[PDB]
């Protein structure tokens, strides 16, 4: 259970296991920190036990870097054995997590080859023909997703780091699930000719108000941070448990209150790195995990905590093309930190475009402004194959207006200031906005 996406609320958690922070391949370690001692059996077990609190049917995705899969040292061996026990006991997923940024630094063919190598290691590790239902890719290319679907018969991937701009750029996509185009991993396939049968999933649910920004001042409640939402770094850790928890609940409520009404289901994604227990303390991080799960179940008791792969396949069972979905969200700020209370944001996402409107609702009769209008019907292109000494860090899909507001043309404007053709495309889907 559950057998269908419709009417249901889902949380998909992944716990990441690694030897260094940003190891996209065996020899390509983009961050110098040696985390061997930050990964222990007791730390991993404690975090899983925290997750199970008030959550006996919950399962999650364990994601390993290549070096964590292959390391022969006792800690990594013990962690792998425990994770196999979890696959058997809980139905947790076990899959590859290539260091967040693989497509930025590695040629497409290399990513594909190494994904296949990891899948083989994992199948043999878990035994009895096990294959994961997803890959925890982060920056994958369209070709990597094609390859997974067609050559590995894997039809879900985390390959959306939704809104990320400055860890590189991958802004422009929908934040909810879609089938990507052969043109660009952030672009919904427009039809049969560019279709890839792989569901592309976000990794961390954002507070949409926070995520409008590029970059950050820090992790605290005094600052702003474009990665604030359900992720623990910018909430439980940066703000402390009490205040952090409130922002995580608020962000979930975007999906589990109004979102479910608008979209027919609600889905929250999150990724917690196992090394956080060492970096920040076992009790703090385990208390945060317990608080998150318990608080979610208290408010939304029928929420299903399932693997990334299970959720993607539930979506794929219901939605067969990008004509089948049309996502809407509405959010006002929480009133905590940079989730500014005076702002109301509305997102619209469909096969042909996404659109965001922002309004200062504290000012009587202040209109909503377009802060993002990104067309998908336009041809898109990804960077040419990079390599580790010539990375391609900017994979964003940007054309008319982008929320990060880094170009003069990104100035927020009334919807009636858009070009006629852009209005016409909008009116096709949402005539009420014009």
From TrEMBL:
Q: Where is the DUF3864 domain?
A: 354-433
For this protein, the record's InterPro entries field holds:
DUF3863, DUF3864
Indicate the segments forming the DUF3863 domain, all copies.
4-349
- Signal peptide from the UniProt entry: none
Q: What is this protein called in UniProt?
A: DUF3863 domain-containing protein
Organism, as annotated: Parabacteroides distasonis (strain ATCC 8503 / DSM 20701 / CIP 104284 / JCM 5825 / NCTC 11152)
